[PDB]
Amino acid sequence: GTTERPRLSVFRSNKHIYAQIIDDTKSATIVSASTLDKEFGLDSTNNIEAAKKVGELVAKRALEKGIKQVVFDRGGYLYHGRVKALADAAREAGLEF
């Protein structure tokens, strides 16, 4: 996120929704969590409940890293579907970036 597209990223990793926050122009987190996370274990991120578990944890630390939370990439939309949870966790936390 320093040439490609510095911002909170939200994409669907195969059958699960990967929540990924990458700093913008100031700073933030450069990681997150999805089905490939630990706390989730063997399959779980399929439902934002899990991806949101850590996807949010990383999110929180993200809004504080830079200054404020980051903005969803493209698959995050205004929030209403599934991917929304990821960008939402950061959203509700305070989406500014």
Which domains does the chain show, CATH number per domain? Answer: 1-97 (3.30.420.100)
Amino acid at 91: R
Nearest alpha carbon to residue 89 among 57, 66, 67: 57
Query: Side-chain half-sphere of 92: how many Cα atoms within 13 Å?
Result: 11
Experimental method: NMR
- DSSP annotation of 29 reads -
What is the C-alpha radius of gyration for the chain, rounded to an integer number of angstroms? 12
Distance separating alpha carbons of residues 25 and 1, to the nearest angstrom: 8
Take residue 44 and report the two structure tokens written for it: 């779980």
**4: burial class by Cβ within 10 Å (0-12, 13-18, 19+)?**
exposed
Beta carbons of 48 and 41 less than 8 angstroms apart = no
**Quick one: tokens of 86?**
């990821």
Those residues with Cβ within 8 angstroms of residue 51's Cβ, 6 or more apart along the chain or in another chain: 16, 17, 18, 19, 33, 34, 35, 37, 40, 45, 85, 86
